Design a binder for this molecule. Sequence first.
Ligand SMILES: CC(C)Oc1ccc(-c2ccnc(NC(P(=O)(O)O)P(=O)(O)O)c2)cc1
Ligand SMILES: CC(C)Oc1ccc(-c2ccnc(NC(P(=O)(O)O)P(=O)(O)O)c2)cc1
Ligand SMILES: CC(C)CCOP(=O)(O)OP(=O)(O)O
Ligand SMILES: CC(C)CCOP(=O)(O)OP(=O)(O)O
Ligand SMILES: [Mg+2]
Ligand SMILES: [Mg+2]
Ligand SMILES: [Mg+2]
Ligand SMILES: [Mg+2]
Ligand SMILES: [Mg+2]
Ligand SMILES: [Mg+2]
Lengths: 346, 346
Amino acid sequence: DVYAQEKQDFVQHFSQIVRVLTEDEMGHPEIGDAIARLKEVLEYNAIGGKYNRGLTVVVAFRELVEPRKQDADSLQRAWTVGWCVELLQAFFLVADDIMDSSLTRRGQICWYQKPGVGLDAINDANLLEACIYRLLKLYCREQPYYLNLIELFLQSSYQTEIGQTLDLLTAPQGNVDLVRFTEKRYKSIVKYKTAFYSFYLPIAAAMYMAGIDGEKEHANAKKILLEMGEFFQIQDDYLDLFGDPSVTGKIGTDIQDNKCSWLVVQCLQRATPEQYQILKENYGQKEAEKVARVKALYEELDLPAVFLQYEEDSYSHIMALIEQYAAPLPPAVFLGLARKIYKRRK
Amino acid sequence: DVYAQEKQDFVQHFSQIVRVLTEDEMGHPEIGDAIARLKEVLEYNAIGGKYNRGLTVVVAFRELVEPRKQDADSLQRAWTVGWCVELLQAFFLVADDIMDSSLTRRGQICWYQKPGVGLDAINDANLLEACIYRLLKLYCREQPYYLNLIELFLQSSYQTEIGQTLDLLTAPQGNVDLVRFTEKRYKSIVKYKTAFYSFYLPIAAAMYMAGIDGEKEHANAKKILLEMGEFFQIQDDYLDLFGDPSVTGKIGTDIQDNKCSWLVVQCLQRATPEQYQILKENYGQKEAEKVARVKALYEELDLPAVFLQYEEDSYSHIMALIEQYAAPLPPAVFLGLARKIYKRRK
Ligand SMILES: CC(C)Oc1ccc(-c2ccnc(NC(P(=O)(O)O)P(=O)(O)O)c2)cc1
Ligand SMILES: CC(C)Oc1ccc(-c2ccnc(NC(P(=O)(O)O)P(=O)(O)O)c2)cc1
Ligand SMILES: CC(C)CCOP(=O)(O)OP(=O)(O)O
Ligand SMILES: CC(C)CCOP(=O)(O)OP(=O)(O)O
Ligand SMILES: [Mg+2]
Ligand SMILES: [Mg+2]
Ligand SMILES: [Mg+2]
Ligand SMILES: [Mg+2]
Ligand SMILES: [Mg+2]
Ligand SMILES: [Mg+2]
């Protein structure tokens, strides 16, 4: 409801974001070609997802700040900081699709697979990261929460890269790694690689912007939001294999990439010795026939039905956490996000 | 002299840098494997260069702060911030060697060419970047210049990526780009990709740490240091082709990578029509025989002798700039750096 409402306004602000980041060409014509590249990078990689994180900043901001304090400039800062989390996301996906050997993203060919781009996308991605701090300087430099936002974006990146490092270590190319695919390890990976930047970061940004800076308040929000993030990544794993890619906008690679997916961890908890063998001989390889063998094994094990049960039990648990930890923040802040992702198909 | 002095002390501090960045494992065992990866990334990619930038921070700090204010903690902050510029460097080289298809760096195989690393080095590189801000928080958070250092590292990265973007745009694989190899373009590329982070950043960091924060003072230092940086990159271009790679620690790729090198720009200013053709048919291609053809052309044009003349005229000009703009800073701050790089062979 409230996200659907805000979507079109959020997305409409993207022009200004592009215009402000491309305006520092005025005084330095010599960087013109780079700034034109930057604009193409922004248009290609910052558009076409759900904008759940940027919108969470805006929705939460509106719900946490007294409407009488939501003047024209305040609101612009809020959808600029929302856009900052979108740019963080864009940076991460561009680099991640290279590392995962992905083909499509958000319904088009991954940036690095475009003829003429290739591994230059590595620089493109980092530029997107640099844009976050340019926007924070340009719009929030005078605000009491400026340092807070800077340290929060920098810390969230570090935590996410640490998680990406656990993701890549647990998934070596060319090697079996079945022994490492545990529930415990899974939880640690998704906590760091997904939950901090995709759930905590946007709500925490809006908190700091509303002057809510206490450690206890931030730790409470984190208890809900890290659990929401773990759940969200489990849905992403489920969708990598069982989603419709004209809906999800992306082709899956977890089985080929030898990834510690929620699906493989479940598969393992339930496999007989002979099925364990099927998994061992077929998992983490590029052969289409071997990926199909693994899928058939998952479906044999009713894994889609096991995912639907986990999703219900988990949502219930997240709602309990909301009842426990939302105060003094409005529960709507957390529920609006839960309902945006509960039972999602993309 | 003064750099040679400080080298061994600087390098000895690397253990502590590793220890502090790997100490946040204590409380979170679950990230243990990632932190062990981080340590391997640090040891492989942060060690073995000249440490000119980290050392410039330390030397300049010692020369700008009254010795009576150089207590144990102050000095540690200074060689930590020196190490931050070294980590920035490490991040950049790891990513750059992937983009340039390089083979060796600092006398060993590039990180991404190690079996088992490959494009995972993209995440490794960004982790190195994240380490800078962790160290600034851990050591300088209480200092009046903390925000100043954060914005200075973030701005320097942005400017360097903009330069890297001009470097990659001017050097398309598969395409002739002779028309773009101008003196003007060359100057713009190296100003952004090299001069800001390699010259301005370390001296400016030491300035801010000495409480020297005025815009006029920073603009004066910048006039010297951007010129020093352009000169330094011209030497790097010269070394890509004419250096001994057991001395430089790296194999060159500029001609194969179609790069707007100082050498190609000079070549072009002096080529006859027929030599222009030789360049056109041979430049920017992987064929060993075609790279050799270009080299023979450079040597035919006395380009090594032209480089030696430019180096002298330029050093003289940089020394004039020092006479103009060093005040009120001690000229030794700038000269120590000039003499460390004038006539360098690595
Ligand atoms: C510096 C850069 C390499 O760091 C990161 C880049 C991307 C990510 C990240 C985190 C969480 N999810 C993704 N992408 C998903 P996705 O490709 O959209 O299914 P995953 O590959 O984990 O399934 C990427 C994390 C860190
Ligand atoms: C995010 C990352 C891709 O950004 C950068 C990474 C590296 C660099 C950079 C800047 C200046 N020099 C280098 N390396 C040199 P080098 O390889 O050591 O000769 P260049 O390839 O320019 O000749 C790299 C600049 C930006
Ligand atoms: C963490 C992760 C699944 C990366 C993809 O996130 P998303 O599914 O939120 O992607 P969009 O930004 O495309 O909506
Ligand atoms: C800017 C550039 C030439 C990158 C290499 O710099 P360097 O030559 O300063 O490298 P070390 O850090 O290896 O000394
Ligand atoms: Mg992926
Ligand atoms: Mg991934
Ligand atoms: Mg996925
Ligand atoms: Mg290079
Ligand atoms: Mg390069
Ligand atoms: Mg070079």
